[PDB]
Design an enzyme around this catalytic site. Structure first.
Site, mmCIF file in Angstrom:
data_model
loop_
_atom_site.group_PDB
_atom_site.id
_atom_site.type_symbol
_atom_site.label_atom_id
_atom_site.label_comp_id
_atom_site.label_asym_id
_atom_site.label_seq_id
_atom_site.Cartn_x
_atom_site.Cartn_y
_atom_site.Cartn_z
ATOM 1 N N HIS A 84 30.573 3.803 6.692
ATOM 2 C CA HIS A 84 30.139 4.569 7.846
ATOM 3 C C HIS A 84 30.108 3.706 9.093
ATOM 4 C CE1 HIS A 84 25.507 3.901 8.411
ATOM 5 N NE2 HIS A 84 25.996 2.852 7.773
ATOM 6 N N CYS B 131 24.604 -0.448 12.177
ATOM 7 C CA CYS B 131 24.081 -0.748 10.851
ATOM 8 C C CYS B 131 24.560 -2.130 10.435
ATOM 9 C CB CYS B 131 24.570 0.299 9.847
ATOM 10 S SG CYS B 131 24.031 0.115 8.147
ATOM 11 N N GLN C 206 19.664 9.510 3.179
ATOM 12 C CA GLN C 206 19.097 10.624 3.935
ATOM 13 C C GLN C 206 19.932 11.875 3.705
ATOM 14 O OE1 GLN C 206 18.322 7.807 7.755
ATOM 15 N NE2 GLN C 206 17.466 9.882 7.836
ATOM 16 N N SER D 58 18.432 8.159 11.460
ATOM 17 C CA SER D 58 18.894 6.853 11.911
ATOM 18 C C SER D 58 19.712 6.925 13.190
ATOM 19 C CB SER D 58 19.716 6.158 10.814
ATOM 20 O OG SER D 58 19.107 6.312 9.537
ATOM 21 N N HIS E 33 26.435 9.356 12.690
ATOM 22 C CA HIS E 33 27.323 8.644 11.754
ATOM 23 C C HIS E 33 28.717 9.263 11.760
ATOM 24 C CE1 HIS E 33 23.667 7.005 9.629
ATOM 25 N NE2 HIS E 33 23.172 8.182 9.982
#
Ligand SMILES: Nc1cccc2ncccc12
Ligand SMILES: Nc1cccc2ncccc12
Length: 147
Positions: free
Chosen positions: A43, A97, A115, A138, A141
């Site tokens: 991702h 990330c 998630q 977060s 993505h």
């Protein structure tokens, strides 16, 4: 008829039909083709000021808005789809990330570990397919299913 989560739609600019997946937010012109214990994905995450932790290896304090993060995501998707840039290259340079250091690879995972919107998109992708923008606590993505 259509694989899980796919619907038909009509282009506003051209009038031609296309297909959209409301689980992955993928969209494409061609009619979609058509579950395992585990999937493997990479991702690219773009965080924003409302992310659960608004900080990353790129930036100590992430201040961009959610709308700004979505614009960045959309720009990365365009360059990946045109072949100007590779997913792995953009993930290593720009993902918020720490998995950026592994070209975005998260390894393999099962249901219940990630998630939920991320999990659902990952499992609805076919092997080799890429999501559209997927929203989580977060951030936003782009997900690539590799296995
Ligand atoms: N299009 C958009 C994307 C992400 C966040 C937003 N917030 C307010 C209004 C429009 C938005
Ligand atoms: N935060 C992370 C999650 C999953 C895989 C990773 N691989 C390398 C570095 C960081 C990672």
């Amino acid at each position: 008829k259509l694989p899980p989560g796919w619907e038909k739609a009509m282009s506003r600019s051209s009038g031609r039909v296309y297909y959209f997946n409301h689980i992955t937010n993928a969209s494409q012109w061609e009619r979609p083709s058509g579950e395992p214990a585990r999937v493997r994905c990479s991702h690219l995450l773009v965080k924003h000021s409302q992310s659960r932790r608004p900080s990353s290896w790129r930036q100590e304090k992430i201040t961009r808005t959610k709308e700004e993060a979505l614009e960045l995501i959309n720009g990365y998707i365009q360059k990946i789809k045109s072949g100007e840039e590779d997913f792995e290259s953009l993930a290593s340079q720009f993902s918020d990330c720490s998995s950026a250091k592994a070209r975005g690879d998260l390894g393999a995972f099962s249901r219940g570990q990630m998630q939920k919107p991320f999990e659902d998109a990952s499992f609805a992708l076919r092997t080799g397919e890429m999501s559209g923008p997927v929203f989580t606590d977060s951030g936003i993505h782009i997900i690539l299913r590799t296995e």
